[PDB]
UniProtKB/Swiss-Prot annotation:
Protein name: Fatty acid-binding protein, liver
Residue numbers carrying Phosphoserine: 13, 41, 58, 102
Described purpose of this protein according to its UniProt entry: Plays a role in lipoprotein-mediated cholesterol uptake in hepatocytes. Binds cholesterol. Binds free fatty acids and their coenzyme A derivatives, bilirubin, and some other small molecules in the cytoplasm. May be involved in intracellular lipid transport.
Organism: Homo sapiens
Subcellular compartments: Cytoplasm
UniProt comment concerning the protein's domains: Forms a beta-barrel structure that accommodates hydrophobic ligands in its interior.
Keyword Acetylation: yes
Sites of N-acetylmethionine modification: 3
Length: 129
């Protein structure tokens, strides 16, 4: 699949922000401050190479990787983890770090980011701007 993920996406809605952030051990102060922030996240894709600028609550996280190659991803807790991002199907980026299964799916202008920890499904829905 050679689908382009490039764009700026405005967060529309999210489910289980607080349950997820609590499950990852984010300090309560940051959870309360960040829970209602609906920012813009950016993806810059060049072939297999990706640069993500994610607005997640009160944190901005920058991650860069090439699909299929070992990368070091920065987590919400500030911890850096070694992992690999893969292309799944026609429109998905999939990775697994610190017992989280992450799925980034693009459907036209709608991006769905799903982070599954135990049976908590943290889902973010963003729209291209
Ligand atoms: C708390 C979040 S949120 C999120 N990603 C998103 O929220 C996205 C969008 C949004 O703002 O809705 C649009 C595109 C991705 C990541 C993350 N995912 C990846 C990936 F590479 F796996 F996609 N790398 O970091 C993280 C963890 C700290 C890491």
């Amino acid at each position: 699949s050679h689908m382009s993920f490039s764009g700026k996406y405005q967060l529309q809605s999210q489910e289980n922000f607080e349950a997820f952030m609590k499950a990852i051990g984010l300090p309560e102060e940051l959870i309360q401050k960040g829970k209602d922030i609906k920012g813009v996240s950016e993806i810059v894709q060049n072939g297999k190479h990706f640069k993500f600028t994610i607005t997640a609550g009160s944190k901005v996280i920058q991650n860069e990787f090439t699909v299929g190659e070992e990368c070091e991803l920065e987590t919400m807790t500030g911890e850096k983890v070694k992992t690999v991002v893969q292309l799944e199907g026609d429109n998905k980026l999939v990775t697994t770090f610190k017992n989280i299964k992450s799925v980034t799916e693009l459907n036209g202008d709608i991006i769905t980011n799903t982070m599954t920890l135990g049976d908590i499904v943290f889902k973010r829905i963003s729209k291209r701007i």
